[PDB]
Amino acid sequence: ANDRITLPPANAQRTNMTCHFCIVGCGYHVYKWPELQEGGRAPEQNALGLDFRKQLPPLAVTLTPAMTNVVTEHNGRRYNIMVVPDKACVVNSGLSSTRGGKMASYMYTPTGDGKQRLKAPRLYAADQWVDTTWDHAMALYAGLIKKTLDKDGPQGVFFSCFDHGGAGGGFENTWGTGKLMFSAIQTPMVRIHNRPAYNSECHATREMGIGELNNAYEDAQLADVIWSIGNNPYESQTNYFLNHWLPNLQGATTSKKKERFPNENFPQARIIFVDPRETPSVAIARHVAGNDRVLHLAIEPGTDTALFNGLFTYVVEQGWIDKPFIEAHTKGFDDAVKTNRLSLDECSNITGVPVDMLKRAAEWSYKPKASGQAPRTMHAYEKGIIWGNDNYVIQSALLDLVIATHNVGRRGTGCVRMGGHQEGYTRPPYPGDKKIYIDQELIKGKGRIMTWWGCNNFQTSNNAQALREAILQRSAIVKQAMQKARGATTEEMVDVIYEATQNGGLFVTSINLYPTKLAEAAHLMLPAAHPGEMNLTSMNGERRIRLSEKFMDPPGTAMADCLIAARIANALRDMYQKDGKAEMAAQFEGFDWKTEEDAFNDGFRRAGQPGAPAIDSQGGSTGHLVTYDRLRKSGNNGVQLPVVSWDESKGLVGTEMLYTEGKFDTDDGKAHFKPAPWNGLPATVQQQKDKYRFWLNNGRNNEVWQTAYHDQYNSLMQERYPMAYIEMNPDDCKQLDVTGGDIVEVYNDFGSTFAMVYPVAEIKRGQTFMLFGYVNGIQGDVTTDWTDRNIIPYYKGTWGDIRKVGSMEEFKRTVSFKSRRFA
Template sequence: MRNTPPLPPVKARRYTTVCQFCVVGCGYKVYKWPQGRDGGPKAANNAFGLDFTRPQPPMAGEWIAPNMHTQVVDRDGSRHNVVIVPDRACVVNKGLSSVRGAGLAQTLYSPERATRARLTQPLLDQGDGQKPVGWDEASDLGARVLKAIIDRWGPDAVGMKFFDHGGGGGGFENNWAVGRFFFTGVGTRTASIHNRPAYNSEVHAAGDAGLVPLTNSYLDAQLADTILVVGANPYETQTNYFLEHMVPNLNGTSMGLKQATFDGEPVDRGRMIIVDPRRTMTVATAETAAGRDRVLHLQIEPGTDIALLNAIGRLVLEYRWHDVAFMRERTEWQTFEAFQRSTLAVDRPLEQMLEDAVRVTGVTREQIETAARWIAEPKAPGIRRRTLLHYEKGLIWGLKNYQNIAAIVGLGLLTGNVGKPGTGISRLGGHQEAYVRPPYPGRRPALNVDEAVRRGEVKAFWVGGCNPVLTTLRAEALEQSLVERGEPVRRALAATRGRPAGQRIPAIVDALKAGGMFLIAQDIYPTATTRHAHLVLSAAQWGEMNLTSINGERRLRLYERFMDPPGEAIPDWAIMARFAHRLRELYLQDRNPLAANRFLDFDWKSDEDVFIDARYQFKGTNTDPMEGYAGITYDLLRKLGTDGIQTPTRLVNRIPVGTVRMHEDGHFYTSTGKARFIPAPRPWPGYAAKVESQRKRYRFWINNGRVNHLWQTLYHHRYLPFYQGRYPMPCLEMHPEDATELGIGPGDRVEISNDMGKVEAMAYPSDAVKRGHTFLLFGQPRGAAGNLVPDHVDPKTTIPSYKQAWADVKRLGPPPEDVKGVSFRPRNVAS
């Protein structure tokens, strides 16, 4: 990073891209030009056409922040400057960068910076550490091992844990190739998605109700009367959706838009209800933007969202604020009757139900009343309030995944808040989406792959673009399995070193029979997981291939390739194709055309070949799921730039037309076409036994999640000083009085431990959390929050309760050297 980034010359090559990080998917512009041919400050001499002899003005100006520039070297040895700046023309971010997006240039591979840590070629561990091998050798050995396992134990003995997302982690192209390989090729059911132990939706209940996970457009956040945010912290983790779309509603900037959209309907500045056990920066900034009287922060006790949502629903029903017309027309009425009886407990006295909710949640009766009023009280006689209901991991990974999601979907259907401007029932989302795969061959609830690994049922485990050693539940136990079960295979590889691959297989199979497991890890960096792998496969990243993804409002864009992958790294789809080709050859040699044909049609020559191949599963009708992209080509996406088109697309006179808002036509994805309420046995299910035993045994609730600066497991950010320096180790927010009682000061090294494992962190005393609550940064390489999470999953969905861990905390010592420079000022002050 230079203190003074150069200006791109007029002739700089220009590319369109989208941030690789969070679900919001902000548009960015990339400029690339040979070193030594910089532009000049006069408007005629730079690619922006702006006069840099004068300072650029605040807000409206174009400024290349130091982290927006870097230098790269392509495979032909040519050296280039690259500048990546937010795109003013993009409807999503309108020129705003987030702290993460502003550092995109720093994530690029450079042999001269810390990103030189990238995996640049396949590696094989034959007992003496991971050493480079060629792609032919890697795919030959790997394919032979997989074939031997499939032939002997069946396809389910091949386990996988892979990205399923968009943005930097995947894209339609890589997801399609991975799905084709494992589901129609290998045919395994032992599959799991990057952040969890099974292959499942995180919102099965929404799907069963007939809703897609992302129903609304970001525009709806500017139009809503009330925005409900449950278990999410959008200032930090959906940043520019919050800043560019929610804040203008809260501060009144979008009033003109509201008046123009809702002619004759009373409109006012928006209100926000935030359900979060922490007083986050989202709460602080929303209060500053809207005024305290228009923000309701419901600081619930852990996992009690469901009791709160159902109490609000019950009040809505009592006050007759429910949307009878919507429910009669667009929902299966009998499911509503079941829902009101069981979930909303209409046969119990209202006061009794509310008293229970107040006791369980820690929220006052008055706050519950206010929430119900803000969500559903008509604005004027006959004019319904428009409420946008959003939720994310606090709810998804909370108490009971299925019932949690059913509760918020139920509240949304009860109040008719879907398929209309200013409404929606949607995930806020974490990463971007690009879920295009053949159907998963297994059933619901999906098999728990982590347990299958531990039990020895998995003979080969292929981990791609994720790092379960840091992120899965009961993570220490999983890592122990990788170590113990990897060792026999490593010995077999050492004993057969130098022999032709085919002759090594009997020894490897013997090792697998003796409890061994062959670990393949595919990634862009070495990680806590790849270090245990026998075979490491080096993948290309964002910017090194063309990829496509959708954001939180289903906006599909092309993220253009603008540089070469390092060394011999290749796109994930090309890795899958290599293995498929080799498996096909091996099965043909075996005179087994049936098995060989499972690996047909991997003959893609380009990124777009894969994109178009995947597209053919969509019809371009209104039965396509939300990712459907009938009629879309790279050429069209290039023309549409960072605005792209909102999926699903349908073909009208052979022209693709996008979908601004889902369910606006009244159609829901059920057999009747109507939405369904999902009844729960009771309004509040209580804690699961494993969770309850931890809760009673340990003093602190260990809430955990992401922070503003950092993306996921820090796979990039651990190498970038500006980001790594802010959180050199996981931070543990704890109430100042709790910290004082334990003799813990800011930055002190602390140990968090329970019956699952332990984590070291730096203490961050903060009034963001209540006494007895804490918040731990998840996924930091120096401390895996997953080590503390019990292995409980919702039996209906196999989704873990990552947010439901309890542990003790003790001081280990003063701040480590690299923590001494860290600021411990409050992270939730906005005025």
């Protein structure tokens, strides 16, 4: 049915759903109704309240076939679903991105895009994939972990697990997994989904006293200037950019600035991008605001620290700083002035940005307005610097600038992460005292068992080729050992596998929605459930916690990850009880959980309460005031964390902006400046740059979500992006005799991978941009092993050569190579 849609009946069930994907956390409604009912076209005869008796005007709805589906429940009954944006949600005001817009299509149905969802335990029984029971899966998995604990201790048990929010994260799930890994198993051999150790993206800003989500989305409406540093927000944080940033650039929020601040000038809002690449976000900002209100600081790759040290030096020398703020609320300023000193000429030589542009950015951002107040300058950053040239140092440099200019704690300011996933962290403390580079450990032959949980590092590790090589080989040893068994009990098989891991083998488990490329190495795969198949809580980039309501059943025996963790814990407890080991059994207590809500009560709602163990929670110690029922009453607007108060008549009252009284998260309540040395690129990256021609920039496409775990099954997505693409300069293209839809090898000392050629006029000569994380042509093969002091990778820092494989005529027939930069 291409040319019509079944309307939701007026009385259709409606539940709340936060978007599964990106940080912004847009609010949606899920309409659910029996397959053989429909709404009428009259606005009072359908659930949308829209008049389908005549054409709707623009902006009246977001509604396509991709936003509809028919689900088949565990009882065999069929129900229409419609997943559409909430017009009254403050986050998105009825906007839907292309990614969230596909939620309905990516819900589980037996015939649709979710048809290959994991529905039962899968086992690679030496030489073939077969189903197995949950009890056999637990006996084998628990069995191995138990054997490893008994013989090697926790250091033999490895995880890479999500720490994020939204789908495949959230407060229930991070608690469940963390409780299992850290309180029960007590393994330190744990990495995170996007980085190869147990660390933070935001060590420097946190240690300086500024948590990275310190403002409201409303702040982007109130700003004079917005910086977007290492950040492509139209593509990566769409509806924050569309619903909040653009209205400011258009002048729609001016009256609200003036109402808040009667005696302050508000010029036209301007936007500054720090990005080596001219992105869609740069183009669209120019289209909306005019070229005169956009500054693209097209820095040389890796030179962000030089940029910020030059701007900091200049604003200090001009006196464009808040000296009363510095004096009352900060420590270390005078030291930072000395350590970070860099002239605009030196800054220009390093960055490649002309001195006029450096001065202009400072004049827009820091020079007092005519009324006497500093500009309200919101500094927004993401992975261009988080995966940049020395994560810790860039944040040090940037924060120094922000603190000196009092661009934290004022409305219309903030130095924030734009975010990736939603947030939803509640976990015990990490049980080690050392940073551990998990990938390197695995590649060196450590560990008996490795579990990928809600992540796929074959596609997303730095130095991903070294990783896959090692894991495939180690998996093979286990497969070969399993093959000699005939008629073995589970316990005998556990011994067979364990022995294989003493000869270089590794048992691999994946806990997932889908097989993924991890199926090339995995011995065991367990089915998980996503939001709508379960209740799930999470918060967005302004700390707004929402409940995503269950409205349908998972596929087969798929389970919420927190309940998978409880399953594992209880299997281990039972084995220890059976083995007469009361002390070891006791470590696996506390997982008597029947629904996801129990994990919410056990984690988020216990943080900082009397008799609670140490819990690190984004909800803080007032987490207990949030209940599922209270979130339901709040709607898609939720509450900004931390919660300050609750009663029946008021609801949840929370916190708009952090640090508005100048009390920071440090020992003394002051924000702390840090030294930020410029040391160039890391030697390992510089070596690549010296040997090879092209900078291999990498990151997001608007349409593609992450490792394309859903998108790989979507015929539209596959027709548009059948292969990972690499944006190349047209002149570079002519020199390599390539054009749109040719395939190239991209390669260096670290790896070899493949991409389709995407000529892009806005790409600079000797620079490229490749889609990351993809199912066909994995970008990460060419990223280096280099990390900063806290084991944060410089994913955006690598160089390689490009060789033509040949012309893919089919790509040329079916794929658009036209410009993605709107003008």
